[PDB]
Design a protein around this ligand. Structure first.
Ligand SMILES: Nc1ncnc2c1ncn2[C@@H]1O[C@H](COP(=O)(O)OP(=O)(O)OP(O)(O)=S)[C@@H](O)[C@H]1O
Ligand SMILES: Nc1ncnc2c1ncn2[C@@H]1O[C@H](COP(=O)(O)OP(=O)(O)OP(O)(O)=S)[C@@H](O)[C@H]1O
Ligand SMILES: Nc1ncnc2c1ncn2[C@@H]1O[C@H](COP(=O)(O)OP(=O)(O)OP(O)(O)=S)[C@@H](O)[C@H]1O
Ligand SMILES: [Mg+2]
Ligand SMILES: [Mg+2]
Ligand SMILES: [Mg+2]
Lengths: 256, 315, 172, 322, 257
């Protein structure tokens, strides 16, 4: 048989999960345990720290007796996942001495068994260290508007200054062709909760981020429809996209 | 800590001590307003970048943040940059007093490629009504002929002993440090016209030994002492000179380049001997320096230099 | 000869004379310099299409009075041809091809004509040589500038300035 | 199987010998937390790289691989690398660091003037967020502006005590026995270079030890590293001084051919032996030094070795006639 | 403390206006007077002249105390105008002796206000006055069909010959791989007036234009569905796109014989 068997509900979920951190990470090692799958990685510039977690709620059949490490490339993994239709179901199967992971796309009415092998590139560089749990300011807003503002202010400069004063969220950019300031305020929409802006403030904050890393972050907007942001001075900012059984979070480092 | 070469940097054009006529001309330019394109050439560390910085500041007042574009060796200066960014900055609208203008300060222009310097001629010629260029280079020979033809050349001479001494006096007056005349003379000797190096050596001596004395200066500069070098270059017999060079200077691990440079700088100030013998000893020391620099720093070369110096001082 | 090629030492009057000759005969000037990307594709798209067209500026400016029948034409001034750096691939060959197969005056300006880079312009263009001006004309021009600027200079200082400048009028 | 040059490398500060004057100062500097840019310059085979890597390790612990950027010589660094890589490393903030990043450039004296200007401007722009360390063999080949930005430290070659201590240490960790005159020959041929000592020791170990317990003599240590012999040198000198032209020339050619020595070593050894002679006339010494320096400078440009050898013989003979 | 305050009712109007001719003009002066906005600019090769008039009937609010000149690049303007969404109002502001210009994007039912600044570019305006001429041929046709004809003929050669003869339009192109010809006859359609080709002519005409200029001009076919064409034997062709409160004119000079 197999030690590891993990089945998904659909095929378009792992697609967007891999598309999330496909532009800032080259290789990644997934840790498969009894409580689900976890992963984390850092970019080559050591600025953005991606952390993925998915429990046993998004899966339908999950069986892993002992935790296993699967270190694989993300580009070839996406090339493999590109061949999957939106009506198939992925079944990750893994055996002893992990050297090749087998993906299997299967349909439930027509016999379409698409099997694909993928070698495992072992890096043995895990370095999982998370210490901060208390942030200075927290907010939640639709990911679409965040991505819009980001890719609108990214053309003007490479450094975007996010500053949270009293109930006024402010994104600033200043360059050679001009300047740009986006000021938004929280509000609760009863007709649509998904278009609301929630904010909790303890102290006024003001700090800058890089446009490239922020553009790499906003690429994970296909996972959910609402993004959470946690800012704290002398602390890496947290950009979280929730998921029915987990989350994808980016830890970003400010600039000078 | 804070480097004294950065804390006591002149922020006004009057605080710069050195070439008086060029500074007077720059003061008149800043007072009138009509500033032309200019290439500032000169030896390193005599206040070239600081001069144009204070000039731009005094010219633009509160508009230095909007009407000054500085490009050093850290920024990228290629074909695309000169064609896009400098051009878009020259055409940029800015309301200034009738005399003032926008300023593009290019530091170390001798490092810019010829192709990049080529695409600046029409840029600086067509927009001469609202943009003035200020290049700062060490060697005016690496600048192409059209550029040198478009702007005025301002040469900066090496700093005299009096100006560096006055600057050091002002620094020690404002810093409240203990000194002696011998230490100041040693600093002037080891600085050879480099104000920045002089201030750095003074700060190092103060932070290391407190009292500025010739012994501490020559201990922190890690150069051969001028006294023992003069003793080596003035012995009556060649054997004593060779022994002094062997036991006192070669055994201590001194670099042959440093020994030759110290002998050169000591022979220049040896007011005891005559002029012709000084010139001939300097010629011999320079020949030995050229021999050392060509890949052979053998002790035999220094021995032959001392032998020739002795034979010339006895003949 | 379809094209004219001006060359000589820097700052002697090449661009000035070219522009003034083009503007005296009523023509319209289309000037391109080293500060513009003169690659093969950009020259094929930008300037090549304007080879045999007529100026909208020259037309809408003045075309009713019988002043000259060439005011609706082009004088294409390619200045600083010797300055096409490595970021301009194929520019010399395309400009040599434009020196032929043309219908409007094309004036090329450079500094060193005998450079191997300017070889394709061997026989296809009329190359005249601008030389360093004589000292007398520079002295007269400097005297005129001085009498207009209300200051008097010793004629020895003027000659010494002419000697140190090596003939550069913009430099004096 | 790792080399003694790499196996006996000091892994921390206390294992470098003969450099206490700089070790105490750098220890005080890293204890006060005021570590500036450091320019370690000196002759090769002294311990600059080992000292700086040991200091970086002692400062950063396990964060060495993430907080230290080791850069080398030309490595196709025209202007591009100093402009992009070093600038980003000085501008890119770490994710979980409390302090400053360190970039150490080895033998950076081979950089061009434009590269040195770019480097000094980069150091000036980011002097608050990171610290720089530059290694050098000759402090004169660097721009005088780069010197005035950092603090210099000259590494004077190791004295006899440090070298003999290291010989003792390498004899503890290796089953070798060394002759009393062997260490004397080693210290005379080393010129304060530990790298060459550790290179020559492993060679003799590999070639000589059949039962791994022999004694290393002066012969093998003179033969392996390709160095002259004092007895042979004095014999060549005496043959040039006393005998006639044919015999002296033949002896010089036989010595320089049957042993594989170069004229530079012969000349420097001959003048070293002549340094202590009680010659009567000073014009003798003057002419000798002048002509020998001329011969050495001409040899430096690769001439016909036989002609310079005959010229050496002629100069030595013609100088000793007063 | 501002000279002019202009308020576009829709943010997409100015975006489309700028995108219509952002490919043929790099730097452009906008002359703001009390009647509206007028802006003309010549091409880099001095072959295509672009003129734009937006009357006061297109601004929701428009003060413009005294006439001003705003010189700005089209690339940065298109980069700034791209940020705004569809449901926003745009406001242009210029301070006394303006060194920059302020663009405000406001929402109708939200407090999200996005303010941008654009640095003006100095431009030596060679203002040339254009006088009405009696064009020999004047017609109007659906912009979609004209753009299709241009894109179809420009693929064969780099020159398109337009001939108006005997109530007959003819677009011909003689290339290397072959030749191409398109014949157009005027007609009216009662059910769809937007597909009727108008025709008014005095003398038959024959002109030759470049392919790149026509391909650039036809990009402004998103402002109006019907484009007007005025042709003369000795005058540059005039291509006009009418806007609900003004127009956009392209003057293109023909080639030689
Ligand atoms: N004439 C001067 N008077 C007073 N201080 C001076 C003078 N010249 C130099 N300095 C000092 O030296 C420091 C460094 O000089 P810089 O002007 O930066 O060197 P530089 O002239 O630009 O030559 P480079 O940059 O090495 S090619 C300044 O910040 C001043 O503190
Ligand atoms: N013959 C001349 N008489 C008077 N002024 C002159 C003369 N030649 C040049 N000048 C001056 O020099 C300025 C620029 O001359 P240009 O002809 O543009 O230089 P150039 O010949 O193009 O050489 P380049 O392009 O810099 S290599 C003019 O604006 C005049 O002020
Ligand atoms: N002071 C020392 N004590 C002990 N071993 C040393 C010492 N200096 C050098 N070594 C040995 O020599 C090896 C090379 O030393 P390095 O530090 O690389 O020399 P360096 O001073 O950096 O000069 P280079 O590398 O030739 S430019 C080390 O790995 C040690 O094995
Ligand atoms: Mg400088
Ligand atoms: Mg010219
Ligand atoms: Mg080393």
């Amino acid at each position: 048989a197999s030690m590891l068997e993990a089945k998904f509900e659909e095929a378009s979920l792992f697609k967007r999960i891999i598309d999330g951190f496909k532009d800032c990470v080259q290789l990644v090692n997934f840790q498969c345990k009894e409580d689900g799958i976890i992963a984390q990685a850092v970019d080559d510039s050591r600025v953005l720290l991606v952390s993925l977690e998915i429990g046993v709620e998004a899966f339908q059949e999950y069986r892993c007796d002992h935790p296993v490490t699967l270190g694989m490339d993300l580009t070839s993994l996406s090339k493999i996942l590109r061949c999957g239709n939106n009506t198939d179901t992925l079944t990750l199967i893994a055996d002893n001495t992990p050297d090749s992971i087998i993906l299997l796309f299967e349909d439930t009415k027509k016999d379409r068994i698409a099997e694909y092998s993928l070698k495992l590139m072992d890096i043995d560089a895990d370095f999982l260290k998370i210490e901060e749990l208390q942030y200075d300011s927290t907010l939640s807003l639709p990911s679409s508007e965040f991505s819009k503002i980001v890719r609108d202010l990214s053309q003007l400069s490479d450094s975007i200054n996010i500053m949270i004063t009293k109930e006024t969220i402010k994104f600033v950019a200043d360059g050679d062709i001009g300047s740009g300031s986006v000021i938004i305020k929280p509000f609760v929409d009863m007709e649509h909760p998904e278009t609301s802006i929630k904010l909790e403030m303890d102290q006024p904050v003001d700090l800058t981020f890089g446009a490239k890393y922020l553009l790499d972050i906003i690429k994970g907007s296909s996972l959910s429809d609402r993004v959470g942001i946690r800012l704290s001075s002398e602390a890496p900012a947290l950009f979280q996209f929730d998921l029915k059984s987990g989350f994808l979070q980016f830890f970003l480092a400010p600039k000078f | 800590q804070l480097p004294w070469v950065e804390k006591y940097r002149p922020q006004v054009l009057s605080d710069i001590v050195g070439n008086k006529e060029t500074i007077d001309r720059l003061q008149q330019i800043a007072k009138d307003g009509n500033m032309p394109h200019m290439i500032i050439s000169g030896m390193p560390g005599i206040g070239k970048t600081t001069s144009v910085h204070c000039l731009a500041h005094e010219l633009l007042g509160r508009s230095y943040a909007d009407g000054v574009l500085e490009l050093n060796a850290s920024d990228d200066r290629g074909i695309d940059v000169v064609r896009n960014q400098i051009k878009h900055f020259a055409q940029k609208k800015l309301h200034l007093p009738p005399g003032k203008h926008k300023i593009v300060i290019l530091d170390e222009a001798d490092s810019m490629t010829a192709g990049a310097q080529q695409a600046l001629r029409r840029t600086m010629e067509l927009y001469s009504n609202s943009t003035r260029f200020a290049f700062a280079c060490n060697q005016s020979n690496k600048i192409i002929e059209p550029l040198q033809s478009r702007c005025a050349i301002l040469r900066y001479s090496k700093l005299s002993d009096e100006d560096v001494l006055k600057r050091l006096l002002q620094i020690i007056k404002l810093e409240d440090v203990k000194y002696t005349n011998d230490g100041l003379e040693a600093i002037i000797f080891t600085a050879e016209g480099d104000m920045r190096q002089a201030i750095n050596n003074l700060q190092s001596t103060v932070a290391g030994h407190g009292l500025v004395n010739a012994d501490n200066v020559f201990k922190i500069v890690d150069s051969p002492h001028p006294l023992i070098v003069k003793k080596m270059l003035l012995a009556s017999n060649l054997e004593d000179s060779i022994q002094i060079l062997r036991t006192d200077l070669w055994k201590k691990g001194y670099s042959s380049i440093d020994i030759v440079t110290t002998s050169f700088r000591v022979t220049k100030n040896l007011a005891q001997v005559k002029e012709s013998v000084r010139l001939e000893m300097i010629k011999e020391i320079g020949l030995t320096h050229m021999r050392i620099l060509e890949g052979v720093g053998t002790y035999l070369q220094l021995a032959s230099m001392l032998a020739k110096i002795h034979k010339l001082n006895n003949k | 000869f379809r094209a004219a090629m001006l060359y000589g030492p820097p700052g002697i009057g090449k661009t000035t004379a070219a522009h003034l000759v083009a503007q005296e005969l009523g023509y319209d000037i289309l000037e391109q310099n080293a500060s513009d990307v003169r690659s093969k594709t950009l020259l094929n798209a930008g300037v090549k299409n304007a080879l045999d067209n007529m100026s909208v500026v020259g037309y809408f400016k003045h075309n009713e009075e019988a002043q000259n029948l060439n005011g609706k034409h082009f004088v294409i001034i390619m200045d600083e041809v010797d300055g096409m750096s490595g970021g301009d691939r194929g520019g010399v060959g395309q400009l040599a091809q434009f020196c032929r197969k043309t219908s409007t005056p094309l004036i090329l300006i450079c500094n060193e004509r005998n450079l191997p880079k300017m070889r394709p312009f061997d026989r296809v263009c009329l190359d005249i040589q601008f030389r360093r001006p004589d000292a007398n004309s520079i002295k007269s021009r400097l005297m005129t500038i001085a009498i207009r600027e209300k200051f008097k200079l010793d004629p020895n200082v003027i000659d010494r300035l002419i000697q140190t400048t090596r003939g550069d009028i913009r430099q004096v | 199987n790792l080399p003694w040059v790499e196996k006996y490398r000091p892994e921390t500060l206390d294992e470098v010998y003969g450099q206490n004057e700089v070790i105490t100062t750098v220890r005080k500097f890293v204890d006060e937390g005021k570590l500036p840019h450091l320019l370690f310059y000196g002759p090769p085979g002294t311990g600059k790289t080992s000292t700086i890597v040991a200091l970086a390790r002692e400062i950063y612990g396990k964060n060495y691989s993430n907080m230290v950027l080791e850069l080398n010589a030309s490595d196709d660094r025209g202007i591009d690398v100093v402009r992009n890589q070093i600038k980003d490393f000085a501008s890119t903030r770490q994710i979980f660091s409390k302090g400053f990043k360190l970039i150490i450039l080895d033998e950076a004296d081979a950089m061009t003037n434009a590269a040195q200007n770019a480097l000094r401007r980069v150091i000036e722009r980011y002097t608050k967020n990171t610290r720089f360390c530059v290694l050098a063999n000759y402090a004169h080949k660097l721009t005088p502006a780069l010197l005035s930005r950092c603090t210099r430290f000259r590494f004077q070659p190791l004295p006899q005590e440090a070298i003999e201590r290291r010989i003792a240490n390498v004899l503890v960790h290796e089953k070798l026995k060394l002759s009393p005159n062997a260490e004397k020959a080693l210290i005379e041929l080393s010129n304060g270079d530990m790298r060459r000592v550790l290179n020559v020791l492993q060679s003799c170990k590999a070639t000589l030890d059949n039962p791994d317990e022999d004694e290393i003599s002066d012969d093998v240590i003179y033969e392996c590293c390709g160095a002259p012999r004092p007895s042979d040198l004095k014999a060549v000198l005496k043959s040039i001084l006393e005998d006639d032209w044919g015999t002296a020339h033949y002896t010089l050619n036989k010595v320089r051919s049957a042993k594989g020595l170069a004229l530079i070593d012969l000349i420097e050894g001959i003048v070293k032996i002549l340094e202590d002679y009680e010659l009567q006339n000073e014009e003798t010494r003057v002419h000798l030094l002048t002509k020998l320096a001329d011969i050495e400078y001409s040899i430096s440009k690769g001439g016909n070795d036989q002609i310079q050898g005959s010229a050496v013989i002629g100069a030595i003979k013609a100088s000793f006639e007063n």
